[PDB]
Amino acid sequence: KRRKSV
Amino acid sequence: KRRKSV
Amino acid sequence: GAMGSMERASLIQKAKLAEQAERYEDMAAFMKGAVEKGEELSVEERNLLSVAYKNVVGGQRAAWRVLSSIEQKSNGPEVREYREKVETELQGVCDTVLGLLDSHLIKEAGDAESRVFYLKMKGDYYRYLAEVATGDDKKRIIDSARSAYQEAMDISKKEMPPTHPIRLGLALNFSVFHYEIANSPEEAISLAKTTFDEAMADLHTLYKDSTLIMQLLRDNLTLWT
Amino acid sequence: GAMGSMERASLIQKAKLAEQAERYEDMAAFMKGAVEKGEELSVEERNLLSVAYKNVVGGQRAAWRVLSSIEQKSNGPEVREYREKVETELQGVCDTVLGLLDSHLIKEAGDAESRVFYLKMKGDYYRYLAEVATGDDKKRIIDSARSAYQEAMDISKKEMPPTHPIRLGLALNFSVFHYEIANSPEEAISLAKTTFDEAMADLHTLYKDSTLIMQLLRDNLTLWT
Ligand SMILES: C=C1[C@@H](O)[C@H](O[C@H]2O[C@H](COC)[C@]34O[C@H](O[C@@H]3[C@@H]2O)[C@](C)([C@@H]2CO2)O4)C2=C(C(C)C)CC[C@]2(C)C[C@H]2[C@H]1CC[C@]2(O)COC
Ligand SMILES: C=C1[C@@H](O)[C@H](O[C@H]2O[C@H](COC)[C@]34O[C@H](O[C@@H]3[C@@H]2O)[C@](C)([C@@H]2CO2)O4)C2=C(C(C)C)CC[C@]2(C)C[C@H]2[C@H]1CC[C@]2(O)COC
Ligand SMILES: [Mg+2]
Ligand SMILES: [Mg+2]
């Protein structure tokens, strides 16, 4: 579902 | 592991 | 104030929003503001109140246990200092709940369900204080917990059916109090056992909350025997 | 103060305790206190700082999205009022981080790894402000994010290998900025793609952080194509 960031 | 409470 | 300018119904509405958002400190502040309107809480509203603070204190207790663990194993001052910080914050929340119970809630609670509900909460928040207590007041904190729980047990036994989720949850937590606060595993075991058995025999008059709690009792019995 | 009386090393120690206890607001306060000692952060200490605030803002953004969702679907004032509360709190945290970046950190960061690290953080916290912005300053918030990210990209390309976890995480987040803030899915896609490919070709010189991030890039590419 939700795009990744870091 | 840990006893239940509510 | 901080919540005194907001409408009672707006506080309850925002508490339910905060719950959905997992903002439990906001939740608890909103519910505290609701109680401070001076009117008695409905069933739903007492549920919201208990869930808000139960979550806040639950995070603080989980953190306290991590720091206490680290501290005992390290046995400089930093671990003890930070454990003390969390501890004092945890105590302040328990004092806030106990203050709300003592000022508004228990006083005006005339029906059985409300009185027992608030007395269980009073037992729980003294129990949380007892989990961290090591002073001269430790003993007095333990008997405040026992005293609240006992009065709640007496009313619930006279006035509520054995399968009432409030009765069941009361017994579940009172039994935990016996086991790990009062050092009375036998009493903890007998109370869980008897509660579970009387409840089985009354299922014929119901349910999700109650079977959930009966499972929690089965879990502790399995853990302790 | 509030942290000015505590030793620098005691702040770092307590930040690591707070992390173990999942007390991320305490964590962030302690790290902020550390930065305020005026000395540059080590690798480990910058990592602690970013993780503390990343977690605090992450909870606030998750809550903001729940309330914004509820608000749009309800389209009284309570939903909007509470969303505004969370929003303003979220902005205050982003301003705090941006203030720490602008006052201490970016200024004194001479090496490549530190400068890029702080410029990525600057991009991220303007990006979080851009997620909630709807005013006249929206456009200026977006270009502050882009500008920080761009400078970080330029340095990282001159000074760091393609597989550096900081380079990879920068590109991952810059690519997200293109996709959902700047409305440039194509640029988001090309940047993720190229970053992933240059990185594959340099694995021969390493690793867990980097393969973790490359997976995050693969995930977004799979999501977006
Ligand atoms: C009053 C009850 C139960 O009736 C009560 O359940 C009502 O309220 C909860 C939460 O409401 C804010 C509930 O709402 C929905 O129906 C559920 C229930 O009727 C639901 C989402 C649903 C089920 O998913 O969870 C509760 C729980 C039960 C789940 C066991 C756990 C939280 C609590 C409030 C706590 C209290 C228990 C026993 C004493 C208690 O521990 C209080 O001591 C003071
Ligand atoms: C600097 C790195 C990575 O090198 C860094 O990882 C170091 O730091 C984390 C956390 O340290 C507080 C780490 O410590 C251990 O080793 C890990 C790493 O070396 C471990 C527990 C281990 C692995 O489980 O996680 C990080 C993560 C990686 C997991 C990808 C996620 C958190 C972060 C700090 C964020 C930053 C990434 C890219 C740019 C970043 O996003 C910052 O932008 C400013
Ligand atoms: Mg009061
Ligand atoms: Mg400063």
Side-chain angles (χ1 to χ4, degrees), chain D residues 32 35-37 96 99-104:
Chain D
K32 178 187 196 283
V35 167
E36 278 170 0
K37 299 294 184 202
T96 296
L100 288 174
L101 294 175
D102 169 59
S103 288
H104 305 248

mmCIF file of all heavy atoms in Angstrom, chain D residues 32 35-37 96 99-104, ligand 4:
data_model
loop_
_atom_site.group_PDB
_atom_site.id
_atom_site.type_symbol
_atom_site.label_atom_id
_atom_site.label_comp_id
_atom_site.label_asym_id
_atom_site.label_seq_id
_atom_site.Cartn_x
_atom_site.Cartn_y
_atom_site.Cartn_z
ATOM 1 N N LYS D 32 18.485 16.632 20.886
ATOM 2 C CA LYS D 32 18.461 18.050 20.693
ATOM 3 C C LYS D 32 19.383 18.711 21.728
ATOM 4 O O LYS D 32 20.153 19.658 21.412
ATOM 5 C CB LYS D 32 17.046 18.585 20.886
ATOM 6 C CG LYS D 32 16.953 20.103 20.747
ATOM 7 C CD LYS D 32 15.545 20.571 21.123
ATOM 8 C CE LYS D 32 15.280 21.987 20.628
ATOM 9 N NZ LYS D 32 15.931 22.971 21.487
ATOM 10 N N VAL D 35 22.999 18.285 20.586
ATOM 11 C CA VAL D 35 23.384 19.172 19.503
ATOM 12 C C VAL D 35 23.684 20.561 20.053
ATOM 13 O O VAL D 35 24.606 21.248 19.590
ATOM 14 C CB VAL D 35 22.228 19.301 18.496
ATOM 15 C CG1 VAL D 35 22.476 20.418 17.569
ATOM 16 C CG2 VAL D 35 22.012 17.945 17.748
ATOM 17 N N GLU D 36 22.919 20.959 21.049
ATOM 18 C CA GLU D 36 23.023 22.262 21.661
ATOM 19 C C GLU D 36 24.292 22.465 22.500
ATOM 20 O O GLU D 36 24.619 23.606 22.877
ATOM 21 C CB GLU D 36 21.699 22.599 22.396
ATOM 22 C CG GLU D 36 20.691 23.144 21.351
ATOM 23 C CD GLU D 36 19.287 23.304 21.845
ATOM 24 O OE1 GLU D 36 18.989 23.010 23.047
ATOM 25 O OE2 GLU D 36 18.480 23.742 20.991
ATOM 26 N N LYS D 37 25.055 21.389 22.711
ATOM 27 C CA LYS D 37 26.387 21.532 23.301
ATOM 28 C C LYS D 37 27.418 22.190 22.382
ATOM 29 O O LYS D 37 28.525 22.491 22.832
ATOM 30 C CB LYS D 37 26.928 20.212 23.781
ATOM 31 C CG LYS D 37 26.061 19.585 24.856
ATOM 32 C CD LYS D 37 26.053 20.415 26.154
ATOM 33 C CE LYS D 37 25.233 19.619 27.134
ATOM 34 N NZ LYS D 37 24.665 20.473 28.276
ATOM 35 N N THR D 96 11.538 22.800 14.682
ATOM 36 C CA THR D 96 12.604 22.452 15.612
ATOM 37 C C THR D 96 13.802 21.735 14.912
ATOM 38 O O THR D 96 14.955 22.158 15.049
ATOM 39 C CB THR D 96 12.058 21.549 16.734
ATOM 40 O OG1 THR D 96 11.092 22.304 17.479
ATOM 41 C CG2 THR D 96 13.212 21.142 17.699
ATOM 42 N N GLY D 99 15.416 24.198 12.504
ATOM 43 C CA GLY D 99 16.200 25.095 13.354
ATOM 44 C C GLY D 99 17.517 24.518 13.834
ATOM 45 O O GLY D 99 18.536 25.227 13.767
ATOM 46 N N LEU D 100 17.520 23.268 14.314
ATOM 47 C CA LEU D 100 18.779 22.572 14.641
ATOM 48 C C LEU D 100 19.706 22.412 13.414
ATOM 49 O O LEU D 100 20.905 22.671 13.537
ATOM 50 C CB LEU D 100 18.550 21.176 15.277
ATOM 51 C CG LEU D 100 18.015 21.081 16.713
ATOM 52 C CD1 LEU D 100 17.692 19.582 17.130
ATOM 53 C CD2 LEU D 100 18.959 21.778 17.781
ATOM 54 N N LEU D 101 19.182 21.984 12.260
ATOM 55 C CA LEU D 101 19.987 21.916 11.027
ATOM 56 C C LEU D 101 20.625 23.272 10.651
ATOM 57 O O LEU D 101 21.832 23.371 10.368
ATOM 58 C CB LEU D 101 19.118 21.389 9.854
ATOM 59 C CG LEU D 101 18.696 19.908 10.091
ATOM 60 C CD1 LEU D 101 17.738 19.386 9.040
ATOM 61 C CD2 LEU D 101 19.903 18.991 10.242
ATOM 62 N N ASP D 102 19.818 24.324 10.685
ATOM 63 C CA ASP D 102 20.266 25.676 10.286
ATOM 64 C C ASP D 102 21.220 26.318 11.315
ATOM 65 O O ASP D 102 22.147 27.002 10.950
ATOM 66 C CB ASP D 102 19.071 26.591 9.954
ATOM 67 C CG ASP D 102 19.484 28.094 9.805
ATOM 68 O OD1 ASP D 102 20.343 28.384 8.938
ATOM 69 O OD2 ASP D 102 18.978 28.970 10.574
ATOM 70 N N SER D 103 21.038 26.048 12.592
ATOM 71 C CA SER D 103 21.848 26.715 13.613
ATOM 72 C C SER D 103 23.194 26.049 13.875
ATOM 73 O O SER D 103 24.262 26.739 14.054
ATOM 74 C CB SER D 103 21.052 26.882 14.919
ATOM 75 O OG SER D 103 20.080 27.876 14.691
ATOM 76 N N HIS D 104 23.184 24.726 13.916
ATOM 77 C CA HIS D 104 24.431 24.079 14.252
ATOM 78 C C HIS D 104 25.016 23.241 13.141
ATOM 79 O O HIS D 104 26.219 23.290 12.844
ATOM 80 C CB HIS D 104 24.236 23.229 15.499
ATOM 81 C CG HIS D 104 23.689 24.001 16.648
ATOM 82 N ND1 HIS D 104 24.433 24.263 17.783
ATOM 83 C CD2 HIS D 104 22.482 24.600 16.829
ATOM 84 C CE1 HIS D 104 23.694 24.962 18.627
ATOM 85 N NE2 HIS D 104 22.508 25.181 18.078
HETATM 86 MG MG MG E 4 19.793 25.609 18.966
#
